[PDB]
Amino acid sequence: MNPPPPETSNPNKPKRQTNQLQYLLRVVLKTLWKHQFAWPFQQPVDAVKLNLPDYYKIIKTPMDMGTIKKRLENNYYWNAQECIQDFNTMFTNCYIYNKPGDDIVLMAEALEKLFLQKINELP
């Protein structure tokens, strides 16, 4: 069975509208989203569909760009660091579960390089 996705709405969280948070959605996430290798990361890993019944026995904090996008849209992140942490969790989960040279690892490595380029300078 797939687990429920990470939470994306929480009215009790502290909330703020900042330039960097806006930039992380408008520029960083929305640009990564259009990359040719973004598709595996646009929604939670469907371990049932992908026949990966061990994925959610190994990965304990799942993360994906669809979840990140919903979080940004709900002002779930107080600051850019919290959002950047979720991107890094997403890449790290991929490198934990898979091995160097796997197609999915090549895809994540490409996206991570672009991500680091795009967050090198924030407003």
The answer to the question of residue 50 lying near ligand WPR (CB under 6 A) is yes
Name all contacts of 60-64 with Cβ < 8 Å and 24+ positions apart: 61/6, 61/89, 61/93, 62/3, 62/5, 62/6, 62/93, 63/6, 63/87, 63/89, 63/90, 63/93, 64/90
Output the smallest distance, CB 2 to ligand WPR, in A.
Answer: 13
Among 103, 113, 116, 123, binds ligand WPR (CB under 6 A): 103
The answer to the question of residue 94 lying near ligand WPR (CB under 6 A) is yes
The answer to the question of residue 104 lying near ligand WPR (CB under 6 A) is yes
CB neighbourhood size of 94 (10 A): 23
Among 28, 45, 83, 84, binds ligand WPR (CB under 6 A): 45
Binding residues for ligand WPR, rule: CB under 6 A, are: 40, 45, 50, 52, 94, 97-98, 103-104
